[PDB]
Amino acid sequence: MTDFLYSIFGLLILLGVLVTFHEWGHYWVAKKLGVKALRFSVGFGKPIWGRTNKHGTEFVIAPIPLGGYVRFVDEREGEVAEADLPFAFNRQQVWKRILIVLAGPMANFLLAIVVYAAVYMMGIAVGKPFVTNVLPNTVAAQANFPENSEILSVDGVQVKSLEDAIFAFVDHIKVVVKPLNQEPTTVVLTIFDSLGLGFGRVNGEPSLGLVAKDSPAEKGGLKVGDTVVSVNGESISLWSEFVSFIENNPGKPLELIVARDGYQQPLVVTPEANERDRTIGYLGISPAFQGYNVINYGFFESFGKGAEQTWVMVERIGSFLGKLITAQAGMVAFLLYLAMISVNLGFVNLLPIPMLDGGHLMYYLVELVRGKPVSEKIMELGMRVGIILVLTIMAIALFFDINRINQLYFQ
Numbered sequence: 001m002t003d004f005l006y007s008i009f010g011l012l013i014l015l016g017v018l019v020t021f022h023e024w025g026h027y028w029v030a031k032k033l034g035v036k037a038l039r040f041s042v043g044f045g046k047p048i049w050g051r052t053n054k055h056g057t058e059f060v061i062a063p064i065p066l067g068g069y070v071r072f073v074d075e076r077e078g079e080v081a082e083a084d085l086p087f088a089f090n091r092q093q094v095w096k097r098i099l100i101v102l103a104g105p106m107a108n109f110l111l112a113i114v115v116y117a118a119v120y121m122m123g124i125a126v127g128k129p130f131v132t133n134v135l136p137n138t139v140a141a142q143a144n145f146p147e148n149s150e151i152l153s154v155d156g157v158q159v160k161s162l163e164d165a166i167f168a169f170v171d172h173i174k175v176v177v178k179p180l181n182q183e184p185t186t187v188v189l190t191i192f193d194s195l196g197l198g199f200g201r202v203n204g205e206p207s208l209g210l211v212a213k214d215s216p217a218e219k220g221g222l223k224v225g226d227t228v229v230s231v232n233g234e235s236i237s238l239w240s241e242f243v244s245f246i247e248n249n250p251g252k253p254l255e256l257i258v259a260r261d262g263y264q265q266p267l268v269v270t271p272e273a274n275e276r277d278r279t280i281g282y283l284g285i286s287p288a289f290q291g292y293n294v295i296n297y298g299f300f301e302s303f304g305k306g307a308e309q310t311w312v313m314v315e316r317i318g319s320f321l322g323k324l325i326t327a328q329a330g331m332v333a334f335l336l337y338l339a340m341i342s343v344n345l346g347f348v349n350l351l352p353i354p355m356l357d358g359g360h361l362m363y364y365l366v367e368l369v370r371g372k373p374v375s376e377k378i379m380e381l382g383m384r385v386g387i388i389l390v391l392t393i394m395a396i397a398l399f400f401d402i403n404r405i406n407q408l409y410f411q
C-alpha cells in the first residue's frame with residue numbers, strides 16, 4: 001500500500017492548510033485591530049505540538065485536522081486582568097469584532113483566489129478547438145470551411161480553447177482558422193449548429209512524437225520522428241487512420257512501412273489491448289503534433305480571474321444550495337481541488353448557524369442595531385470608507401493608464 005501514503009498526505013496537507021489559514025485570518029485581523037489572542041488551536045484530539053507566543057498566545061496543533069478555533073481575551077469566557085482589558089475582544093467597538101468574525105471565511109476565499117492565481121501563471125492545459133467536420137446547407141457550407149482545422153482568432157480576439165470560443169461567440173464575423181498543411185485563413189463567414197461546425201479529436205500527419213518504454217511500438221522498432229506511410233500494404237495519410245488500424249487489430253501483427261531519415265523502413269508491431277477492454281488495440285505512441293493548448297496569464301490579471309472563478313464557484317454553490325432546499329493531471333489539479341474545498345468551507349461556515357461565524361455575524365449585527373447612541377456617526381464612516389474607494393480605485397485607474405505608456409510605422 002503505497003498510494004495510501006500520498007493520498008492521506010495530500011488529505012492532511014489540504015485540511016491543515018485550510019484550517020490554518022482560516023484561523024490565521026481570524027488571529028491576524030484581531031491582532032492588527034488590537035485584540036490579544038489566548039489560544040490558536042488547529043485540529044481535534046490530543047496536542048502533538050504546543051508553543052506559547054511572546055504575547056502569551058498558545059499555538060497548539062492536534063493530529064485530526066477537521067476544525068479549529070482562536071480564543072481571544074474575553075470577559076464573557078473568563079477572568080481578564082485589569083491591565084488586559086484594552087486588548088479584550090468584547091471591549092472593542094462592534095465593527096472591530098464584526099471584522100474579526102468575518103476574517104475567517106474571507107481568509108478562505110482569499111486563499112482560493114491566490115491559489116487560482118497560482119495555477120493561472122503555471123499554465124493550464126485546455127483542448128485545441130479543432131473543427132473535425134462541416135455540415136451541409138449551413139452558413140459554413142457556402143463559406144467552404146476546411147475539413148480538420150484549428151481555430152486561431154475569431155472576430156479579432158485570440159482564443160485557445162473551446163469554452164473560450166463559445167464565450168467569444170456570445171461576447172459580441174471574422175474567423176481565422178488553420179487547416180492541415182496550408183496556412184491560416186480568415187474564412188468569409190449545440191451552439192455551433194447555428195453555424196454548422198462540429199468539434200472533435202485533433203488530426204494530423206501519422207508522425208510519432210513519443211514512444212513509451214517497453215511498449216509494443218518500442219519492441220517493434222518504432223522511433224520518434226517516424227512517419228507511417230503504409231499499414232498492411234495500404235498507404236495512410238492521417239494520424240486517425242493509424243489509430244484506427246491500431247485499435248481495430250488487438251493482438252494481430254501489423255506490417256508497417258514508415259518514412260525515416262529520408263528512406264523507408266519496414267517494421268512489424270503487435271499492439272496489445274489493455275485490461276479494461278481487450279477489444280481495442282494499443283501499442284503506446286503519441287502524435288508529433290500537439291492536441292493541447294497552454295493558457296497562460298499575467299499574475300496582475302491572474303488575481304482578478306481567480307477572483308472571478310471564485311465568484312463563479314460561489315454562485316454554483318448557491319444554485320446547488322437553493323436546489324437542495326479537459327483533464328490537466330498532476331499537482332496542479334490537487335491545488336484546484338484544494339481551492340474549491342476552501343471555497344466550500346468559506347461558504348458553509350458563513351451560514352447563520354449559531355456556533356459558526358455566520359451566527360456570530362448575526363449576533364453582532366443585532367447588537368449593533370440595538371446600540372444606537374449616536375446619530376450622523378454611522379453616516380460619517382459611510383463617506384470615509386467611500387473616499388478610500390474613490391481613492392484606491394483611482395490609484396489603479398491611474399497606474400493602469402501609466403502602464404499603457406510603458407509599452408509603446410513598421411510593416
Ligand SMILES: CNC(=O)[C@H](Cc1ccccc1)NC(=O)[C@H](CC(C)C)[C@H](CSc1cccs1)C(=O)NO
Nearest residue numbers: 018019022026066067068069070104349355356357
Ligand atoms: C469541516 N469543518 C467545519 O466546517 C466546521 C463546522 C462544521 C462541522 C460540521 C459540518 C459543517 C460545518 N468549521 C470550523 O470548525 C471552523 C474552522 C474551520 C472553518 C477551519 C470554526 C467553527 S467554530 C468551532 C468548530 C470546532 C470547535 S469550535 C471557526 O470558525 N474558527 O474560527
Ligand SMILES: [Zn+2]
Nearest residue numbers: 026104105357
Ligand atoms: Zn472562524
